[PDB]
Amino acid sequence: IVGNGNVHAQVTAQLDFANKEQTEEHYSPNGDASKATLRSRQLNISEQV
Amino acid sequence: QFSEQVNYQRALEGELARTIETLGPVKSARVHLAMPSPSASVTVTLEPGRALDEGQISAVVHLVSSAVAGLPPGNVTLVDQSGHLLTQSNTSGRDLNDAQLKFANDVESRIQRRIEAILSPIVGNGNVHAQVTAQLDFANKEQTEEHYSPNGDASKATLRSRQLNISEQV
Amino acid sequence: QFSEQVNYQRALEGELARTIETLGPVKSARVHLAMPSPSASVTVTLEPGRALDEGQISAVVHLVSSAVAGLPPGNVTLVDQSGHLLTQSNTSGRDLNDAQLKFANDVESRIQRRIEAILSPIVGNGNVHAQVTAQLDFANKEQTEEHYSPNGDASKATLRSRQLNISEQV
Amino acid sequence: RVHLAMPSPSASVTVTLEPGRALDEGQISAVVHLVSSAVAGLPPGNVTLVDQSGHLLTQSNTSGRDLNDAQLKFANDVESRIQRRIEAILSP
Amino acid sequence: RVHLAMPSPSASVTVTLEPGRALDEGQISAVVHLVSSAVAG
Amino acid sequence: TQRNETSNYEVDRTIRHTKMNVGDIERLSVAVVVNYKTLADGKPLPLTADQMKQIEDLTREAMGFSDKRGDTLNVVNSPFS
Amino acid sequence: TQRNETSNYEVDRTIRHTKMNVGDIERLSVAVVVNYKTLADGKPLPLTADQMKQIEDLTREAMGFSDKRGDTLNVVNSPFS
């Protein structure tokens, strides 16, 4: 666009070199009863009048 | 026993020196081994008026390294006829990480060539230039999902056992 | 016994070098073998005015690798008559995740040729160009589903045992 | 009609068959060795031969991961079989 | 030119075909299975 | 009244284990320049808007442009030297 | 009344194990200088504003500029020597 020798550019590259690990461990919320997954359930309902 | 290994190493050193000599712009060779962590040292005198490139030294380096059992390229050193330690493998710092630039350059060159090859027929042979910058993910990345279908609904539950006691006194 | 092994190994190296010498554009070769971490190196001096491609070097590395037991092709190196490491796997940082690029090139080239071959009869021999960019999934991926048919319905459930006690006092 | 591009060289030959003929397996080696030799420094593996309708006569191979491209060859074979069937049922 | 690897075994054959001929894909398998079954394992 | 109930369930389970590839294209930024001409002998004059729009689309398709990756594309028309 | 309820759950889980790269670009700073000329024979008169804007765009795209990383770019026009 501007010509063979009409432009000069200089670049600085800030680089990271730190060895960096990470171990995420995510769990879905099961608070809502319509999306919970039950393995067992013991439900006792006693009532005396 | 000992002198046998001595003779064998000393003969194979001259052998690899002779092979390295027959490599074009090289005048003389001298290979040396370290055999009990293995290591090797080669003193190559290139022919006056030439100089191997950075990816050209790796040729002789892994030639003498893989000619020897248990020797990684990194323990192989090479010295020119006037200083010039052309093998920086002693550090072995960015050797893996300088190939990332080559791979990224290959990717962006392929995309640039595709853009020019698709756009030149319309606008002309030399009426278009494209430059492509490709950011790449080099991070090793694992993942182990584990999803369970909800069984809150009684119409989609799957039962194995069920003890349902019902009492009623009036 | 140690002399037996060295002379046998040297004879194998010379024999293999002579065999890969009779390979057309190969004036002289030199096999070097190391069985302690198996390894092998070849110094090919091609006949002037030629160059073997990467798949053409795969041929020779598989030829000299399989000729001795336990040696993978990855420990076999080739060096040309002027440096020019012909095997990519030497400085094995990754050196194979760059094969994904040329595999993608093959895929895009086939799709491009298919579009060109189908569209040429209609619009003309050279009146159409197509460029294909293919995103490829190169990630290892496993899955283990486990589906259970619901048996909440009594008319579809399957019973193995059933203990039913019914009491009634009036 | 052979086209060359020398800046890693490569070549593309598009042979125009005489009406009602096709090259045999041993005939493509002749042309590949002819086009490879007549130019200095061009290996025979860089030139791609293409018929008048697809049908790449000189295939490409892989060095590092040579398993995923064999899938490509199998797909090409299946496509060629189905294409030949369509052509041989529609030509009459 | 046949070569063996006998200590997993392997074989390497350097066949030079006569000028003006080329074996087919199922024809290389001939020599392949010959040298493979000429050796145990 | 009383109502006791113990229930043991069998649950659908999916274990998807991925090992992501090393070297994927996270983001692309492409800049393209097109030369003026538009005339056989007269003064060069900017290519029409519809044409530049179609070069933009063609280079968008050749790039593999995807808003998910946040790719950026910029094509400009200016005379060369 | 009474209500006992012992509920055992199966929970969805995701485990990502990342090992970030060694040598990534945290931030880029680029300075660009362009030349005056703009005429066949007359005195140089500063490149016009829209042209400057498009040079800035082109170098922004060729940089891989991303304000998330905090990249910075500065383009100026001044006669050379």
From Swiss-Prot, chain A:
Induction: Inhibited in nutrient-poor medium.
Cell compartment(s), UniProt: Cell inner membrane; Bacterial flagellum basal body
Disulphide bonds in the chain: none
Role summary: The M ring may be actively involved in energy transduction.
Family: Belongs to the FliF family.
Subunit structure, as described in the record: The basal body constitutes a major portion of the flagellar organelle and consists of four rings (L,P,S, and M) mounted on a central rod. The M ring is integral to the inner membrane of the cell and may be connected to the flagellar rod via the S ring. The S (supramembrane ring) lies just distal to the M ring. The L and P rings lie in the outer membrane and the periplasmic space, respectively.
UniProt name for this protein: Flagellar M-ring protein
Gene name of the record: fliF
